[PDB]
């Protein structure tokens, strides 16, 4: 993805303050709440029938940590996302059967979460930079679909 060096620096500076464990659970939980149809992939997680059940579900929290840990690794290779997420793309297509539109939804929910978490520090230019990142990650994850 083409971020400028000042965009790259802003993205990394902010990410160093993120607790991936907390943010991961919040982001995946909000996705399941705001866009309920995404629950279709997680029937194995148990009760997701109300917002309180979703946000308190330990499997949702654990999975959120995994997802955002993989995202975090990806931020070290902004110049080669395709390469970093290649195996994961194949897994999401062939084994998990996840419609890539879901990666885009998660991207926007994550941007909301960062804004909620950091408030005024999540400025318009910092947002713009993260929008490029989340689009890039979604595109990388969708690359091996067939």
């Amino acid at each position: 993805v083409h971020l400028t060096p000042e965009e790259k620096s802003a993205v990394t500076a902010l990410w160093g303050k993120v607790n991936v464990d907390e943010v991961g659970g919040e982001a995946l939980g909000r996705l399941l709440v705001v866009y309920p149809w995404t629950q279709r992939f997680f029937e194995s997680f148990g009760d997701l029938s109300t917002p309180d059940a979703v946000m308190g579900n330990p499997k949702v929290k654990a999975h959120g940590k995994k997802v955002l840990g993989a995202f975090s690794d990806g931020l070290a290779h902004l110049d080669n996302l395709k390469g970093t997420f290649a195996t994961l793309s194949e897994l999401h297509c062939d084994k998990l059967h996840v419609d890539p539109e879901n990666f885009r939804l998660l991207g926007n929910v994550l941007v909301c979460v960062l804004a909620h978490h950091f408030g005024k520090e999540f400025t318009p230019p910092v947002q713009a930079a993260y929008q490029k990142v989340v689009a890039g990650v979604a595109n990388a994850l969708a690359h091996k679909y067939h």
């Binding site: 309920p36 149809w37 995404t38 279709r40 297509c93 059967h97 419609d99 890539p100 539109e101 679909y145």
Partner: protein, 141 residues
């Protein structure tokens, strides 16, 4: 919002389709799976090869639903009530995909109905498929 002209147009076009409705349903599906491969993510249990009986069978069900929608164009939300429930609470297909199938249905109809597929009818059919889509996703949240 369908105008009387739209309803008139859809009823004439769908009428010429007639007994081939199921056949066209299957072709639209095949066009979708090939043109937009991410849609296959909702059919992991299907044999998606050319001429699959599951595809032919599912195409028939989709077509029969559209025929019912055309017959009940003035009260689609009740006529499709069972389907909208099934899509919202069970199948849970992301709404973007409805646009993809709609496009492929238009392509299919265009390829089979040269004389009837005028710009006016194309426009009415597009609105009609968008209204059906809207009904099928109306109970998602």
């Amino acid at each position: 919002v369908l105008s009387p002209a739209d309803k008139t147009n859809v009823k004439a076009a769908w009428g010429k389709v007639g007994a081939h409705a199921g056949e066209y349903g299957a072709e639209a599906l095949e066009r979708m799976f090939l043109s937009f491969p991410t849609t296959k993510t909702y059919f992991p249990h299907f044999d998606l090869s050319h001429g699959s009986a599951q595809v032919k069978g599912h195409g028939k069900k989709v077509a029969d639903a559209l025929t019912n929608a055309v017959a009940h164009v003035d009260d689609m939300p009740n006529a499709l009530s069972a389907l909208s429930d099934l899509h919202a609470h069970k199948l849970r297909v992301d709404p973007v995909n409805f646009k993809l199938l709609s496009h492929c249905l238009l392509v299919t109809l265009a390829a089979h109905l040269p004389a009837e597929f005028t710009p006016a009818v194309h426009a009415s059919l597009d609105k009609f498929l968008a209204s059906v889509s809207t009904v099928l996703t109306s109970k998602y949240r």
